[PDB]
Amino acid sequence: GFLTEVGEARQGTQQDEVIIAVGPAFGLAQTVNIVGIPHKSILREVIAGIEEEGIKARVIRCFKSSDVAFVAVEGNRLSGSGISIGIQSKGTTVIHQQGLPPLSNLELFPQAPLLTLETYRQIGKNAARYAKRESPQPVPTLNDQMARPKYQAKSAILHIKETKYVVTGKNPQELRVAL
Amino acid sequence: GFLTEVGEARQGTQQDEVIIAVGPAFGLAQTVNIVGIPHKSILREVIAGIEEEGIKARVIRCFKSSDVAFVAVEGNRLSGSGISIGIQSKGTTVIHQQGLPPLSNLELFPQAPLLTLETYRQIGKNAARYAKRESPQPVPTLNDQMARPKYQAKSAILHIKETKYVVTGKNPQELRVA
Amino acid sequence: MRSKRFEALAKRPVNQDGFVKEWIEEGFIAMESPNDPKPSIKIVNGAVTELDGKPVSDFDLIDHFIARYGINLNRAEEVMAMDSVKLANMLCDPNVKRSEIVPLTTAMTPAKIVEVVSHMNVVEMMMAMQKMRARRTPSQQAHVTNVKDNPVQIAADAAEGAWRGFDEQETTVAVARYAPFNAIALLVGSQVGRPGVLTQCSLEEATELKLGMLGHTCYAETISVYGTEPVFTDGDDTPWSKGFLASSYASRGLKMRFTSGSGSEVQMGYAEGKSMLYLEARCIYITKAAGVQGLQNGSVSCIGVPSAVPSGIRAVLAENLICSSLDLECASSNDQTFTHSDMRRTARLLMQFLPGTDFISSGYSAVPNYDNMFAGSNEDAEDFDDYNVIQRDLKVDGGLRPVREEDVIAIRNKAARALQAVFAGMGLPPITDEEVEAATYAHGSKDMPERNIVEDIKFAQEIINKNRNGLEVVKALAQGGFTDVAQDMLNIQKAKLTGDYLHTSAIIVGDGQVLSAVNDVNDYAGPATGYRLQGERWEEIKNIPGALDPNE
Amino acid sequence: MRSKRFEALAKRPVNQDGFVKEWIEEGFIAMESPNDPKPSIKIVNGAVTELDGKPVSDFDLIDHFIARYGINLNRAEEVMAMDSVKLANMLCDPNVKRSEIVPLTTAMTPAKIVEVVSHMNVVEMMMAMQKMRARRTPSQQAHVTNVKDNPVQIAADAAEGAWRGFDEQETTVAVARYAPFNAIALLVGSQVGRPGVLTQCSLEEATELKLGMLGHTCYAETISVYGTEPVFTDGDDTPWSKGFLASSYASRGLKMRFTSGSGSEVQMGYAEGKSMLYLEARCIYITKAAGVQGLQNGSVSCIGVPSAVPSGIRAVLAENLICSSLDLECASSNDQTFTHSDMRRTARLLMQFLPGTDFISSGYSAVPNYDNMFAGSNEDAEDFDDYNVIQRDLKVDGGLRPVREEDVIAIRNKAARALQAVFAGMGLPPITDEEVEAATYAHGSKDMPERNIVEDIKFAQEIINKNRNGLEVVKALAQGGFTDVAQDMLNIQKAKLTGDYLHTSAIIVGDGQVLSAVNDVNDYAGPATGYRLQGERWEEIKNIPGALDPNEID
Amino acid sequence: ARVSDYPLANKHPEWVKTATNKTLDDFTLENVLSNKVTAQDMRITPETLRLQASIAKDAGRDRLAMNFERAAELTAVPDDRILEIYNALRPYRSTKEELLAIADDLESRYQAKICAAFVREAATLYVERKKLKGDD
Amino acid sequence: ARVSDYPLANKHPEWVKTATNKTLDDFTLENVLSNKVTAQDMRITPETLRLQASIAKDAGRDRLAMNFERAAELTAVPDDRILEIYNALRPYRSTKEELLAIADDLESRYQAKICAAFVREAATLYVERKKLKGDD
Numbered sequence A: 001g002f003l004t005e006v007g008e009a010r011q012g013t014q015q016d017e018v019i020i021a022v023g024p025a026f027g028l029a030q031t032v033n034i035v036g037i038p039h040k041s042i043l044r045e046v047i048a049g050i051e052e053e054g055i056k057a058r059v060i061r062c063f064k065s066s067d068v069a070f071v072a073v074e075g076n077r078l079s080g081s082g083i084s085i086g087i088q089s090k091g092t093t094v095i096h097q098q099g100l101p102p103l104s105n106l107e108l109f110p111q112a113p114l115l116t117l118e119t120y121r122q123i124g125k126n127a128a129r130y131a132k133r134e135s136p137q138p139v140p141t142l143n144d145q146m147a148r149p150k151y152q153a154k155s156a157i158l159h160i161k162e163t164k165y166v167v168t169g170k171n172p173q174e175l176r177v178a179l
Numbered sequence B: 001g002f003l004t005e006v007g008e009a010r011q012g013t014q015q016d017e018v019i020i021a022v023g024p025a026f027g028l029a030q031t032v033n034i035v036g037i038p039h040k041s042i043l044r045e046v047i048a049g050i051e052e053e054g055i056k057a058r059v060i061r062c063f064k065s066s067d068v069a070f071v072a073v074e075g076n077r078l079s080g081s082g083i084s085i086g087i088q089s090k091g092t093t094v095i096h097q098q099g100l101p102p103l104s105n106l107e108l109f110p111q112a113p114l115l116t117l118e119t120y121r122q123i124g125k126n127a128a129r130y131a132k133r134e135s136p137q138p139v140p141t142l143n144d145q146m147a148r149p150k151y152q153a154k155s156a157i158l159h160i161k162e163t164k165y166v167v168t169g170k171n172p173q174e175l176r177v178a
Numbered sequence C: 001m002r003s004k005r006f007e008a009l010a011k012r013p014v015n016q017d018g019f020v021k022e023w024i025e026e027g028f029i030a031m032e033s034p035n036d037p038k039p040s041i042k043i044v045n046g047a048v049t050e051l052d053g054k055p056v057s058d059f060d061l062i063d064h065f066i067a068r069y070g071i072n073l074n075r076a077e078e079v080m081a082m083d084s085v086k087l088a089n090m091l092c093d094p095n096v097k098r099s100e101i102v103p104l105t106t107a108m109t110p111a112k113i114v115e116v117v118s119h120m121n122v123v124e125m126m127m128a129m130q131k132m133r134a135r136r137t138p139s140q141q142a143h144v145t146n147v148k149d150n151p152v153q154i155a156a157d158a159a160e161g162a163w164r165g166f167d168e169q170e171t172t173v174a175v176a177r178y179a180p181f182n183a184i185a186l187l188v189g190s191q192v193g194r195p196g197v198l199t200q201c202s203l204e205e206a207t208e209l210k211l212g213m214l215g216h217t218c219y220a221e222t223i224s225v226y227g228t229e230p231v232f233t234d235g236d237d238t239p240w241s242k243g244f245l246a247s248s249y250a251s252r253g254l255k256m257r258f259t260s261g262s263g264s265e266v267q268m269g270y271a272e273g274k275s276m277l278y279l280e281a282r283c284i285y286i287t288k289a290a291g292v293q294g295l296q297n298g299s300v301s302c303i304g305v306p307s308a309v310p311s312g313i314r315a316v317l318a319e320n321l322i323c324s325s326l327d328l329e330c331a332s333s334n335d336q337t338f339t340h341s342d343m344r345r346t347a348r349l350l351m352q353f354l355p356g357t358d359f360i361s362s363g364y365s366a367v368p369n370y371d372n373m374f375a376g377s378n379e380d381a382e383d384f385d386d387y388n389v390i391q392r393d394l395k396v397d398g399g400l401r402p403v404r405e406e407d408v409i410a411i412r413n414k415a416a417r418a419l420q421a422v423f424a425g426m427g428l429p430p431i432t433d434e435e436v437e438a439a440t441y442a443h444g445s446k447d448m449p450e451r452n453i454v455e456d457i458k459f460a461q462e463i464i465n466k467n468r469n470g471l472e473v474v475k476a477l478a479q480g481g482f483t484d485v486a487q488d489m490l491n492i493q494k495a496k497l498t499g500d501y502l503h504t505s506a507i508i509v510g511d512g513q514v515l516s517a518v519n520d521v522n523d524y525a526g527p528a529t530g531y532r533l534q535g536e537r538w539e540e541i542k543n544i545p546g547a548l549d550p551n552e
Numbered sequence D: 001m002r003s004k005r006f007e008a009l010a011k012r013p014v015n016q017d018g019f020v021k022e023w024i025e026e027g028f029i030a031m032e033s034p035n036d037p038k039p040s041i042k043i044v045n046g047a048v049t050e051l052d053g054k055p056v057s058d059f060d061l062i063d064h065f066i067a068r069y070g071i072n073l074n075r076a077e078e079v080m081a082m083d084s085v086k087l088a089n090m091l092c093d094p095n096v097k098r099s100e101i102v103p104l105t106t107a108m109t110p111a112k113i114v115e116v117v118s119h120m121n122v123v124e125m126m127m128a129m130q131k132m133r134a135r136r137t138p139s140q141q142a143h144v145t146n147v148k149d150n151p152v153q154i155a156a157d158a159a160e161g162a163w164r165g166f167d168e169q170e171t172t173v174a175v176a177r178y179a180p181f182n183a184i185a186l187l188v189g190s191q192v193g194r195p196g197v198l199t200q201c202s203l204e205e206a207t208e209l210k211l212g213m214l215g216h217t218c219y220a221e222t223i224s225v226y227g228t229e230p231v232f233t234d235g236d237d238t239p240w241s242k243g244f245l246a247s248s249y250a251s252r253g254l255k256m257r258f259t260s261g262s263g264s265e266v267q268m269g270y271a272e273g274k275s276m277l278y279l280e281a282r283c284i285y286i287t288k289a290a291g292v293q294g295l296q297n298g299s300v301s302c303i304g305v306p307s308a309v310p311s312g313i314r315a316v317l318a319e320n321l322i323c324s325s326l327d328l329e330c331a332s333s334n335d336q337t338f339t340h341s342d343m344r345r346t347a348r349l350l351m352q353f354l355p356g357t358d359f360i361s362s363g364y365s366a367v368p369n370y371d372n373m374f375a376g377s378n379e380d381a382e383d384f385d386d387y388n389v390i391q392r393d394l395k396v397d398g399g400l401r402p403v404r405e406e407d408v409i410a411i412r413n414k415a416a417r418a419l420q421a422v423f424a425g426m427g428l429p430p431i432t433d434e435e436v437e438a439a440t441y442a443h444g445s446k447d448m449p450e451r452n453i454v455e456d457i458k459f460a461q462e463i464i465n466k467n468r469n470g471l472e473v474v475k476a477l478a479q480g481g482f483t484d485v486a487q488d489m490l491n492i493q494k495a496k497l498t499g500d501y502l503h504t505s506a507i508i509v510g511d512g513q514v515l516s517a518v519n520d521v522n523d524y525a526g527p528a529t530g531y532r533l534q535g536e537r538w539e540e541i542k543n544i545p546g547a548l549d550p551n552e553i554d
Numbered sequence E, F: 001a002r003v004s005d006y007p008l009a010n011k012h013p014e015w016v017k018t019a020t021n022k023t024l025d026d027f028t029l030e031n032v033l034s035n036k037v038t039a040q041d042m043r044i045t046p047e048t049l050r051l052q053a054s055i056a057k058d059a060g061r062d063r064l065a066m067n068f069e070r071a072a073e074l075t076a077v078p079d080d081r082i083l084e085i086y087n088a089l090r091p092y093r094s095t096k097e098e099l100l101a102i103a104d105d106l107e108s109r110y111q112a113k114i115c116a117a118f119v120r121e122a123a124t125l126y127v128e129r130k131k132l133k134g135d136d
């Protein structure tokens, strides 16, 4: 238990920030991603990657959807930089940008089993560099053709489980992250 | 050409010989076994394994059949010690004994691909040891479960071709080995 | 302690696969769910007022589209009243003609036809598929890709795939802006291997249509449909946007099909409590309703979802059978990895291979899977000899053939040399003689010299930006020592003028002969009738490497 | 210069397999040879005077036996005049009852039924096989052997195999004189795993009959028949010697079948110019003519011969279909290695697995193939989980089930302890507690302590030489604290007194319930009829290891 | 036309003209290389598509025929306009009046009557199913 | 008997008696340990095999029934003699006279008329096909 709501997420008051938008069960009913990496460690590394680039990290929980693109869209609407990172409980991640169509993105990570804590840190880094209007080399991932069929069914179960915590019409909550 | 007929085969009289009976196409239409081991190196190792035990090795060529059991049965009736060795062109081999049922045997080697030149010599030893009324241990062979299906079809083809050289009602012919 | 028997079994590749127990409430069940609607239809003055228990007041866009366009209302009430077991019996009965069944199955509601095929085991389904397949001749479709988007290698692999027997071939990109090069390389290489092979380059919808309009593809396939309205909407389409896109392709003379497959909706979490097979039936009827001639289905990229649950591979055969029974061409998947086990993936393939479908695989990988840019197929190039051996073992025409190494070398070399002349004539970044040699003898991109990707991408993009069209490729071939390949390329373009290969199951064989369900009608009527592997084609399939000649 | 594509393919296991081109003149062709005789028959007052183009004056012993005993002469002329394509259509038509077909197919001559099935592709043959299989319920047969003839391991492996679902299990010996120990261990182990499992110990004919006479087996299967007179003669039998042996087994209350299989005759070089399938049809009719209830075929040990040539694996499915169509129980091979390729051997297995036969395999290896003393099966113990997964994938009952490790450990342990009591009560060389533990957790004989072979052979031979019968095994069990296994062993001996399990396809299920083609009649009539995987049995097949329970999350 | 008239390239090649009134035999390497035929000549006609629609109907495939009839209308619609209409039909892209305006333009500018009715139908049902702009 | 009478164990277990007139209930662990019953008691009867032959006929399996009829006769033939007759029927093992003497012995000593006829048939056809002693 490392995430506390501190009120409805507000529009960013500064251009030098990235919003990390997490799904409704992240750190709550689910605490690890598809291959057992803890949500606390994932969030720690994404934040650290953002802060390494001298950019502030803000974390919000989205309730209107469990879809990683729509979660990230909720974040990019409020991000002072227009840049957001969406993360589902099973670990799928996207770097999004205000003004892009919802299914478009800056970078998509659509094979959650392949993400390491190193990957999550670099995702934070690249988002912060997008917020500084830079063009970072996209984050690389290690290929594994057996990952998709091996984890697809389990991913769908985890996604269904998280979707049960969607609340229609509920605004995103800003989160405080425990030390 | 390393085998030469020298007339009809005589019957052994004293218990001092082991007869090597080969197939109608052994060393003629065919010169190698199922896995390429030449018939010259095969027949050399068997004779060397027999004469190593103090037994005289006599080579004959059967015509009445290509069946290794029946080739060997023709050899044990003419063997002085009652012990024979049947060898097909494809390399299948059996140690037979006169008086045994034709389909029975002392030792049978029913996987010709699994036979090395060390086995052909070792076969000659035990066959000579059976002639000396001794009780030698069974000749060992490597195990390979894939060998039977991998070589079954080719060995049937090689057997069909040697069976073509079968002359009905023809008595064995003793040979001279270089 | 531990049983060493069970430790041995724990090591087996199959135990690395993903398996889940059924979750009926959420639609995590392949077929035969108590939640699926009971079949029904009510019609008043030619309008459907009820569809599978749902009143028209509650129709979503999919119900509206299927009820208005996807069901033959002339016999819908008649077939609804028939016993579903009797109908399943008719499907696998050798003496009930395909032409007698099609007016009944195309009048079934989605729940009705699911109920019918759900009475069948996989032997009965295969017995039916060999009859309900639209094209009398079965065929095969290949992936031709590599992780570098190397165009010389794509051309050479496409020529070999065409030489081995694929009648459709498909590429896509590792790097999006390479696409015009991949498409041209696939088309040129395919025509070198066998004139008439149809090619596609699967991309974002707008870019793919543009390449079609420019003449660098022959068909399109990966236009998706989905079985619940939320999933459809979350893909940013409706049945009407997809139907409009389908007619747009036909208006340019380009063949096309949709893509669907079991499990897509529960994977997204919006199965509306229904089985995968019932929702896939809705996808099949959307395809029918749009007037699209065929469908790539059999789970496709969602295969890890039905395969995880009981009867999932049987459901995959069932959804292929529904497609063919609804008188659609079926490009029956077998195109995506789902298992670590050679035993398991063979059993999955044989369901379509043994009876034959319009394309037994919709993406057999004609490259080793490490080069497969759809993230790996159920079969790849290293399986070519096993595939041919099983054809020969079972006397089954799986659409491919054994080939001589020297023929493959020569055809791969010609394709690479033809593409070299294309690139020279069009002023594209050169293909060197060393690249032609490497592509001739390559197994995959590990064997290819690296290209200057920056240059390739700049000129590939300019093909789009400058609207450089397929006649420029014809010209480059004809002026560069390849008037023969030039003529074959021109002949593929002329096929778009006639509309003949827009029809159900169409391929182009022999000397430019279109072969579709219209003129290659499947006339199966039991043993010794319908398509039979025989004559010269059987001699071709018999002639595998390693067969010892008893005369030697 | 070499294509690297072809270098990659040259490394594939399938290219280690043996392949040959057809040699029609010598019978090296699986089916559809132009040398096979055209079907014909003439009948005079119930006597055949002509059979498939051969007048009776020219009949060999096989022709005579088949003509006198192997054809339903009442409808032979009627079915001969029917079109073979129409008959092949009837075979796979779901709406032509098995009970309407059997009087016609049993009336066909060998050449006629071969012509009929040769019109069919493998999909049509499977469609027919699910109808023509005699027993409604499909089943499975296992090999239980090891390279050491270790009896403790045999008992444990046999118990695990019965627990997994084999209804027949088969042992044989690496060392001939071990046979009585192998047979008893297989019988005791099988009854511990599931009472009713039938056991055989495949040996030279006289020794095997003697062990049956002593009560240490339940049935016999490896009594061969052959399809040409020279090959039959060279096996040192005729149809009459084999038919006498068949009745001899039944006179002792023992179920039996013959063994045949495509390719045996051309392998011996005496195919008389005929296709493998035609000669195998002669073998099938010899079995019918003898009054033998069933047959092990599908090439069996000769599988390297039909598999080397075109349509060979189709011909194997065809010979199983002919067997079932002649109203014989079919134990449909899948019991011998023929390929290095998992893809290829899976295709070969599915021909029987998908429709179901009386025994889908006549010798699935219930041990790793290195312990298989039939030189390796088409499937072995390390395939168990793949087999169960495919059952679940396709909703096909392949006769086996997933099982819990703790249940197998307990069932193997009980079998080893039960055999230990038998050896101690009969005064045989002891089975130590250490051996009981090793057998409990073993994968194969690499895990077993080595025994005193000289000593075991001595007491094994005394079992036959002193005619120590199965009641002594019962005694030792009831006296050594295994009253339940003793009772089960007695019940299987009592089954030999009723004759019930002598019938076509008979197995023993549940609580001593004989299940054969007589009371488990296959009544297939298309979709939703006949045997269907459903209910508790489907729940059993669903329950594979590794299936994630969604209730584990949240 | 009937199924016996198919394939057109075999049974009636002379029936196949292009949007610029070229024939199949005009498309030779010689004419390509001299630019006597160009890419703008190489377009299937509404006449050809309506013939194929008739063949599809005779083959028992009425819905495939309707697709080809829509396609025949769309031959007259420029490439860029094809993509605009496709995009406009995606959920939440268009108002109802924007879709009705597309249909009126299809009908009056291109005589694309069937496609116009198809778009008006989408507009009507997008109202009911809340798939217009502002509904998300 | 008919298929409705099968299995005998379930439908008519009292119809099953052994060669020493024991019933199925006589075979208990108690009697085996008491040696009230022994292996010589546990032998299927010709009566049981003829019942099963009738059931095989009723199930449409005439040749199976005939095998059971032969088996019923061979229940009376000692184990060793069974093996002797089997071996004598192997090719080249017997003269025509020896097979005829086996048949007469079968019939006169065991009342095994069907088996006797079976052996005489072999003798006749072994003459025709040269499978008697001295023919190899």
Ligand code: B12
Residues within 6 Å of the ligand: A067, A068, A069, A090, A091, A092, A093, A094, A103, A104, A105, A108, A109, A110, A111, A112, A113, A147, A148, A149, A151, A152, A155, A156, A159, C224, C234, C235, C236, C264, C265, C267, C268, C269, C301, C302, C375
């Ligand atoms: C399976 C799959 C699907 C499935 C399941 C989607 C879902 N959300 O449940 C289906 C067929 C339904 C589908 C639909 C779409 N997909 Co898709 N999909 C894949 C695929 C082949 C594999 C992903 C996978 O199995 N990972 C393994 C599992 C264990 O990891 P995971 O982290 O749980 O994976 C999840 C995500 O990949 C997610 N997902 C899948 N597709 C898409 C697309 C987008 C935009 C997003 C945000 C998420 C997403 O679904 C997976 C399961 O929940 C990838 C190909 C690839 N190269 O990765 C394309 C891919 C991710 N899909 C893509 C596209 C374009 C789409 C669609 C927009 C297509 C359309 N026009 O309808 C829709 C979007 C649906 C949506 N709103 O999410 C593109 C994304 C391009 C990009 N970088 O933005 C990809 C990369 C394919 C490609 N090379 O073009 N897809």
Ligand code: B12
Residues within 6 Å of the ligand: B067, B068, B069, B090, B091, B092, B093, B094, B103, B104, B105, B108, B109, B110, B111, B112, B113, B147, B148, B149, B151, B152, B155, B156, B159, D224, D234, D235, D236, D264, D265, D267, D268, D269, D301, D302
């Ligand atoms: C396939 C096979 C057959 C085939 C082919 C026989 C042939 N002559 O072509 C069939 C089914 C017809 C058969 C028949 C018999 N077989 Co066999 N057969 C095998 C088997 C399973 C495989 C051998 C093989 O394929 N090797 C691979 C090939 C590539 O090597 P190869 O050297 O060419 O093999 C040839 C010989 O093995 C020969 N052969 C096969 N069986 C027999 C039996 C005898 C006595 C002889 C002399 C030769 C012989 O045939 C093979 C091909 O031509 C072996 C089991 C084993 N342990 O090997 C039993 C085996 C060799 N057979 C055996 C027996 C008992 C017989 C029969 C007498 C059975 C019978 N009573 O009918 C007959 C004999 C027929 C004869 N006159 O040769 C026993 C031999 C026991 C012994 N030590 O004497 C073996 C060892 C099996 C066992 N379970 O014990 N057999």
Ligand SMILES: CC[C@H]1O[C@@H](n2cnc3c(N)ncnc32)[C@H](O)[C@@H]1O
Residues within 6 Å of the ligand: C222, C223, C224, C225, C226, C259, C260, C261, C262, C263, C264, C299, C300, C301, C302
């Ligand atoms: C990334 C989504 C894409 O995957 C393809 N696809 C693969 N499997 C399916 C499927 N089962 N349903 C729908 N679309 C599928 C299709 O091209 C779609 O646009």
Ligand SMILES: CC[C@H]1O[C@@H](n2cnc3c(N)ncnc32)[C@H](O)[C@@H]1O
Residues within 6 Å of the ligand: D221, D222, D223, D224, D225, D226, D259, D260, D261, D262, D263, D264, D299, D300, D301, D302
């Ligand atoms: C070693 C010969 C033995 O192998 C067995 N066998 C295996 N395959 C066949 C077969 N195809 N035909 C006849 N007998 C066979 C049978 O038990 C025979 O006695």
Ligand SMILES: [Ca+2]
Residues within 6 Å of the ligand: C141, C170, C221, C296, C335, C362, C363
């Ligand atoms: Ca595809």
Ligand SMILES: [Ca+2]
Residues within 6 Å of the ligand: D141, D170, D221, D296, D335, D362, D363
């Ligand atoms: Ca067996």
Ligand SMILES: [K+]
Residues within 6 Å of the ligand: C225, C226, C227, C260, C261, C262, C263, C264, C265, C279, C280, C283
């Ligand atoms: K679907």
Ligand SMILES: [K+]
Residues within 6 Å of the ligand: D225, D226, D227, D260, D261, D262, D263, D264, D265, D279, D280, D283
């Ligand atoms: K045979």
Ligand SMILES: [N+]
Residues within 6 Å of the ligand: C200, C201, C202, C203, C208, C219, C220, C221, C222, C223
């Ligand atoms: N596509």
Ligand SMILES: [N+]
Residues within 6 Å of the ligand: D200, D201, D202, D203, D208, D219, D220, D221, D222, D223
């Ligand atoms: N046996």
